[PDB]
Amino acid sequence: MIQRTPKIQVYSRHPAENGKSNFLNCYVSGFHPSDIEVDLLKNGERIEKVEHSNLSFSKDWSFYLLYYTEFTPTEKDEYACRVNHVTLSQPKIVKWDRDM
């Protein structure tokens, strides 16, 4: 058996075709087993509507999740990714760096 803790990256992107759109992304990478729980948070509150969730694997024991949705950040709001996985004794919360 093998288990690996996910790497977690949280960042924003504007699609070049629609630049006034902004997306909040959580890239959760290289984890095993594939069982996982991943939420986007806004001011501590779970975001129910996340239109994109994109799972793949490389080696049979390495999984990759892109989790993202459109959003309209203000300098007031705090956003984060919250991840649960068997390798994590507590939920891991990664805050969005507003400049990323």
UniProtKB/Swiss-Prot annotation:
Its main location: secreted. One of its GO terms (cellular component) is cytosol. It is found in: Secreted; Cell surface. Disulfide bonds join 26-81. GO terms for molecular function: identical protein binding; MHC class II protein complex binding; peptide antigen binding; protein homodimerization activity; structural molecule activity. Keywords: Amyloid, Amyloidosis, Disease variant, Disulfide bond, Glycation, Glycoprotein, Immunity, Immunoglobulin domain, MHC I, Pyrrolidone carboxylic acid, Secreted, Signal. Changing residue 60 to P: Increases tendency towards amyloid formation. Glycation of Ile-2 is observed in long-term hemodialysis patients. Changing residue 61 to V: Increases tendency towards amyloid formation. Residues 6-94 form the Ig-like C1-type domain. Heterodimer of an alpha chain and a beta chain. Beta-2-microglobulin is the beta-chain of major histocompatibility complex class I molecules. Polymers of beta 2-microglobulin can be found in tissues from patients on long-term hemodialysis. B2M alone (not in complex with HLA-I) interacts with M.tuberculosis EsxA (ESAT-6) and an EsxA-EsxB (CFP-10) complex; the tripartite complex can be detected in the host endoplasmic reticulum. The B2M-EsxA complex can be detected in patients with pleural tuberculosis and is stable from pH 4.0 to 8.0 and in the presence of 2M NaCl. Belongs to the beta-2-microglobulin family. This is Beta-2-microglobulin. It comes from Homo sapiens (Human). The gene is B2M. The chain holds residues 21 to 119 of 119 of the full protein.
